């Protein structure tokens, strides 16, 4: 399965002009388009090689869409001030994510159309693509409004139609790169500590897509040892990195195994020091 997702942010800056409005689009973990209202001559712009050959009509249509959305989000930010009885002097953020998860046979697995205000859930289209989940009393105003307007119908039509159709085209355009499942290359490093014990660190490098699970285990028992798991991070070349550590007694290193699961692996990896 694959995903097409757009991430939209407006941030007000009272006293410094109109809000900054931005969009970024992704296929799976690969960015491919951007918009930034603060750029000189703002236009929708390519950020992956396999989108650069969409014709001029594509960029004109997406730029027009972004500039209409920008006006919408200006209105939304002003309305949020009224809903929350907030002063006109503060900076606030409105975020929006929309997109589709699609199986390789074209089946829509899940559609998303959801918002956050000042970094917290505001309103979200439910998995049925028919009803809304509102996070507070302000969002209940929006829910009533969009229910009476039938807003979800148009949203669902995008998620079941346009989103699915264009994801298919993008995967065709970028089939030389987007379909890969590069498995992690893994190893364990060993670091004696001054305290007399040992840090074992299990590394996973060079993998795509970004989803991965790294786990330290013994022989089924729950590990009470001190552990640490860093956030998955981009290498910058289209692959990702992660590590996971455990502090173990000196002389007991061989009791611990690191287990690695990833879409690109035919079998999960098990590694020891």
């Amino acid at each position: 399965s694959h995903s097409l997702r757009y991430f939209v942010t407006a941030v007000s800056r009272p006293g410094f002009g109109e809000p900054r409005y931005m969009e970024v689009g992704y296929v799976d973990n690969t960015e491919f388009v951007r918009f930034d209202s603060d750029a000189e001559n703002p236009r929708y712009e390519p950020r992956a090689r396999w989108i650069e050959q969409e014709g001029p009509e594509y960029w004109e249509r997406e730029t027009r869409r972004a500039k209409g959305n920008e006006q919408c989000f200006r209105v939304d930010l002003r309305t949020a001030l009224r809903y929350y009885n907030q002063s006109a002097g503060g900076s606030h953020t409105l975020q929006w994510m929309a997109g589709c998860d699609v199986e390789s046979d074209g089946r829509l697995l899940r559609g998303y159309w959801q918002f956050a205000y000042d970094g917290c859930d505001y309103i979200a289209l439910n998995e049925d693509l028919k009803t809304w989940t509102a996070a507070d009393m302000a969002a209940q105003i929006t829910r009533r409004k969009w229910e009476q307007a039938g807003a979800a119908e148009r949203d669902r039509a995008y998620l079941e139609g346009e989103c699915v159709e264009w994801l298919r085209r993008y995967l065709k355009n970028g089939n030389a790169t987007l379909l890969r499942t590069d498995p992690p290359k893994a190893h364990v490093t060993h670091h004696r500590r001054p305290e007399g014990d040992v840090t074992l660190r299990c590394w996973a490098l060079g993998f795509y897509p970004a989803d991965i699970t790294l786990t330290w285990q013994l022989n089924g028992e729950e590990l009470t040892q001190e552990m640490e798991l860093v956030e998955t991070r981009p290498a910058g070349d289209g692959t990702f990195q992660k590590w996971a550590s455990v502090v173990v007694p000196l002389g007991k290193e061989q009791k611990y195994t690191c287990h690695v699961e990833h879409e690109g692996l035919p079998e999960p990896l098990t590694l020891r020091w």
């Binding site: 594509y58 929006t142 995008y158």
Partner: peptide, 10 residues
Amino acid sequence: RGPGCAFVTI
């Protein structure tokens, strides 16, 4: 292609 607000506001 991306989603359009279609001037549906909160």
